[PDB]
Every structure is written in C-alpha cells, then in structure tokens.
Amino acid sequence: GSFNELNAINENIRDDLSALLKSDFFKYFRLDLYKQCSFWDANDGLCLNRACSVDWDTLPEYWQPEILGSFNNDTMKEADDSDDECKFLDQLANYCDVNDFNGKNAVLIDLTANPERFTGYGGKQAGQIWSTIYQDNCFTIGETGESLAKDAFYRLVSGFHASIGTHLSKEYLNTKTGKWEPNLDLFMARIGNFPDRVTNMYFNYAVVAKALWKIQPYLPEFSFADLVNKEIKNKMDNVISQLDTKIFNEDLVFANDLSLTLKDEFRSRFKNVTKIMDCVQCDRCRLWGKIQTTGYATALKILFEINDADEFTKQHIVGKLTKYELIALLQTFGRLSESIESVNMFEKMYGKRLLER
Ligand SMILES: Cc1cc2nc3c(=O)[nH]c(=O)nc-3n(C[C@H](O)[C@H](O)[C@H](O)COP(=O)(O)OP(=O)(O)OC[C@H]3O[C@@H](n4cnc5c(N)ncnc54)[C@H](O)[C@@H]3O)c2cc1C
Ligand SMILES: CCN1C(=O)CCC1=O
C-alpha cells in the first residue's frame, strides 16, 4: 500500500535525483580524515585477526577488505576554511570554525568516485558498532512519547542498517570474474527474508522525503550570477516538487507527540551515532556512515523544528542549514532511492530465480 505510492514516486525521480547528486555542488563531501574513537584507536590502530572482516586467504591481495574499503585519493580535494560546505545556505548567494567544523585533517571526497558498495567490512567490530547503536536507544522515562521516541529511533537505525545491507548486496564483488554485480543470495540473507527491514527503508525514505518537501519553499538561492549553481537549485526543486504525497500528513517522527526534552535527547542520540562512525575502520563505510547519520540528524532537526513554526521561523530554520547538511540530506535520500530501486531489481531476480528451479 504505502510501498506502492512511495515506489511510484521513486520511479519518477530516480534518474533526476541521481543526476543531481553527480553535480559539482552535490558530489563532494567534507570529511575529517582524523578519527577520534573512544572505544579504541582508529587513527593508526589497525584491525588484526580479521576482527573487521566478514566471513580471503585464497583471494588476490587487491581484493582484501582493507583495499575494497579504501578511498580513491586521485579525486579528493583539499578542504580549506573557505570551503562553502561550512557556510549557511543564506551565505551561499572563520565559517568552518564558527560552525564547529574542527577537523584536524579535513578533505573533500568525490562521492562519484567513492560509491557505497560491498567492502568486506564486518566481523566483531562492525557487530559491536551496530549493537552499541541499537543499545543506546534510551530516553528519559516518564516523558510524554518515550515509547514513540524509542520506536522511531530504532526504525531509523534499522532502515539505515538495511540500506547499507542492500547496497553491499547490489554492488557485490564476484571473486571469480572480478566484476561488481548484484548478489541475490546475499540480498535475501540480509534483506529479502526479513520483510520489516524493507519496511524500515521505506519509512526512512518517507522521513527524508518529507524533510526535503518541507524545506523546499524556504531554500535560499545558491547564487545570483552563477548560472551553473542557478540551474542546480532549479533541478533540485524539480526533484522535490515530485515528492508530494498524503503520506506526509502522517507525523512520521512523532513531532507532535514528543516533548521538547525527548526531541533534544533524540537529536542528541543521533549526534552520538554520527560520532561512533569515527570508530569504523573501513574508510568508505565511515564516509557513507557519516553522510547518512548526518542526513538523518538533519531530517530530524527539520521535522522537529518546522512543525509548529511560523513562516518567519521557517525561512530562518532552512536558511541556517549548512551546505554540508543539505548535501548530507540529499545524498542520504539518494542512498534510500537507490535502496528501493535495488529491492525492486532484486524482486525481479528472485522471480527469475524460482523460475529456473
Ligand atoms: C556505519 C556502518 C557502515 C557500514 N558500511 C558498509 C559498507 O558500505 N559496505 C559493506 O560491505 N559493509 C559495510 N558495513 C558493514 C555491514 O553493515 C555489516 O555489518 C556486514 O556486512 C557484516 O554483516 P553481518 O551479517 O556480520 O551483520 P549485520 O548484517 O550488520 O548484522 C548485525 C546484527 O544486526 C541484525 N541486523 C541486520 N540488518 C538489520 C536491520 N536492518 N535491522 C535490524 N537488525 C539488523 C542481524 O540480525 C545481526 O544480529 C558497515 C557497518 C557500519 C557499522
Ligand atoms: C537499561 C539499559 N538501557 C538503557 O539505558 C537504554 C537502552 C538499554 O538497554
């Protein structure tokens, strides 16, 4: 039912969204190569005894997890204090220091050259990080909406977890031919045989779509004279304008039910998630983890704040988002759009699977 509608919406915007995310404005993401993990050392501390790999001795050295999850340094660019990602959307048409972008070794990564895919990352470390995230699902008891908050937090994490599982299944490395291709059996093992994980990805899709729909009317211009950035903002509006659905009438994140205390806690909770991404040993995994956790935190900030705000406050909320956050939000939407498409694609592979049996 709900899948049918969100799926139809996705069919319409899938290619335009993908095109938009490849643009110069959206293709880069600021990442601090410096990692500050509390649970352990992620700066120089390596992961031994395959504590960070999924269940490689018989495969070439260039297909080891450490390589599959490594960055492509050739596309990366230097990130200075003048980097627009640190600026408020209001400023587009110091800054990095003001908005707390205090990275010791920040760089701009080319997301087109560093896609989310199977990297072989996993084992005990990946398991510990996921468990820690699900376990930190705690809110002040007695607060109005405590159970709703715990349910929403869980669903967002689960949909995030599922989107990653879907991507590593869709873009899997065949160790025989050495080509990246869909792996149906893995998809079934990570997503297909667990219906609720698919539901949670649709939930996340609706949450992010709603945040984008809500801010669209208040997005400031990207530039006045620059034709390139001008057309970019136009293409963004064209995508968002097609997201309208009555599903948005639903209070997906219980914005109307959660107390102000729970909202801050909820927001603070996702901040901790973004932070534990620094413990992820796999570079590409950490990058996309940072992108998506930030995207979800941004969707939450938007939905919680725009809910009961007057028009003057709406333009303020949207205008103070940083380019960094907007990139995170749209790239996260792009991963969810791709995840739903992958589910559709796999359903067809499944069909032609049982037919060949
Ligand atoms: C932030 C982060 C980013 C990552 N990015 C990548 C990546 O880009 N590419 C790549 O190959 N690997 C990536 N990984 C690894 C990947 O998520 C898996 O942990 C991995 O493939 C090994 O899988 P597994 O079966 O051991 O456990 P997982 O499949 O992670 O399972 C963890 C446990 O959680 C449960 N679980 C699984 N999915 C869900 C869900 N959606 N909802 C509720 N429970 C679930 C399982 O039953 C199991 O108990 C990342 C890990 C983290 C922590
Ligand atoms: C009782 C311990 N606990 C919390 O405090 C939140 C999640 C959890 O299991």
From Swiss-Prot:
Assembly and binders: May function both as a monomer and a homodimer.
Result for mutant: C47A: Impairs the capture of mixed-disulfide with PDI1 thereby blocking its function. Loss of activity
Gene from which this protein is expressed: ERO1
Domain notes for this protein: The C-terminal part (437-563) is required for the association with the endoplasmic reticulum lumen membrane.
GO molecular function, one term: protein-disulfide reductase activity
Protein name: Endoplasmic oxidoreductin-1
Positions of the catalytic residues: C282 (nucleophile), C285
Glycosylation sites per record: N73, N272
Range of the intact protein held here: 56 to 424 of 563
Cofactor(s) in the UniProt record: FAD
Protein task: Essential oxidoreductase that oxidizes proteins in the endoplasmic reticulum to produce disulfide bonds. Acts by oxidizing directly PDI1 isomerase through a direct disulfide exchange. Does not act as a direct oxidant of folding substrate, but relies on PDI1 to transfer oxidizing equivalent. Also able to oxidize directly the PDI related protein MPD2. Does not oxidize all PDI related proteins, suggesting that it can discriminate between PDI1 and related proteins. Reoxidation of ERO1 probably involves electron transfer to molecular oxygen via FAD. Acts independently of glutathione.
Coarse class of the protein's main subcellular location: endoplasmic reticulum
Record text on activity regulation: Enzyme activity is tightly regulated to prevent the accumulation of reactive oxygen species in the endoplasmic reticulum.
Substitution effect: C52A: Loss of activity
Domain of life according to the entry: Eukaryota
Membrane topology: Peripheral membrane protein
Keyword Iron part of the UniProt annotation: no
Subcellular location: Endoplasmic reticulum membrane
EC class (word): oxidoreductase
